[PDB]
UniProtKB/Swiss-Prot annotation, chain B:
UniProt-recorded name of the protein: Outer membrane protein Omp38
GO molecular function: porin activity
Cellular component, GO annotation: cell outer membrane; host cell mitochondrion; pore complex
Organism whose genome encodes this protein: Acinetobacter baumannii (strain ATCC 19606 / DSM 30007 / JCM 6841 / CCUG 19606 / CIP 70.34 / NBRC 109757 / NCIMB 12457 / NCTC 12156 / 81)
Membership in a protein family: Belongs to the outer membrane OOP (TC 1.B.6) superfamily.
Name of the encoding gene: omp38
Effect of residue 53 to A: Periplasmic domain no longer binds diaminopimelate
Domain OmpA-like: 3-121
Role description: Functions as a porin. Induces apoptosis in human cell lines through caspase-dependent and AIF-dependent pathways. Purified Omp38 enters host cell and localizes to the mitochondria, which presumably leads to a release of proapoptotic molecules such as cytochrome c and AIF (apoptosis-inducing factor). Binds peptidoglycan, contributes to cell wall maintenance.
Keywords in alphabetical order: Apoptosis, Cell outer membrane, Host mitochondrion, Ion transport, Membrane, Porin, Signal, Transmembrane, Transmembrane beta strand, Transport, Virulence
Part of the intact protein present: 221 to 339 of 356
Amino acid sequence: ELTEDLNMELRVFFDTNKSNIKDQYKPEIAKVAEKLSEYPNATARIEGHTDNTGPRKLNERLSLARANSVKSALVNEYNVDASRLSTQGFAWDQPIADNKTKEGRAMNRRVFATITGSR
Amino acid sequence: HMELTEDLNMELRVFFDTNKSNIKDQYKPEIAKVAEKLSEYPNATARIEGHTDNTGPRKLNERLSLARANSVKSALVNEYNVDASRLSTQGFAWDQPIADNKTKEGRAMNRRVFATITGSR
Amino acid sequence: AXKXX
Amino acid sequence: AXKXX
Ligand SMILES: [Cl-]
Ligand SMILES: [Cl-]
């Protein structure tokens, strides 16, 4: 008998007021897809964020759109089954850096996807 | 960017004939797979433990239990070119029964080697 | 609709 | 050297 536990952490960043995925992240996303195909029971927790600039409602929608964009790539570009992926936006409520600098805001405009599962 | 880890956990069970420490071809396929996974997980290591049923001299069984563990290691090292430094062996004689020694079936189950493979990549 | 920064 | 059973 044997078991193999899969743990992944994917990080995607976005430009201001955009939810499109840059080409530089595509390879990472392909890697995630590959692992999801190797671990059928694995699921992904995709969470989107925005920096603290702009309207609250706009950022609520944008953060969700960012997580859904990462899921869309996975499902439509990498054949990953949509039923295995969750998405959610947290607006600016969960910053990983200070919004007072352009580097910090750059860091907050992102999507973190945590993949877990065993086979 | 993205971080990724895979944790391996597996157990191999090998059984032996009375007073015998030879690996019966009945378990070669089982062993072949362990070697393959040890290849897939280069950092993986194995804790090989041998046992005996409760019949016979204590010393004979302490040596037999160890001999059984070393037999499985030798299969991996010699037949599967596995690095010996990745495999540890220990004998427990009859101190860790898993079945009833009063029955023929239980003794057969106690004459064993349990190998636990664990690693990451 | 329209963030800045 | 010599288990039985
Ligand atoms: Cl960045
Ligand atoms: Cl058996």
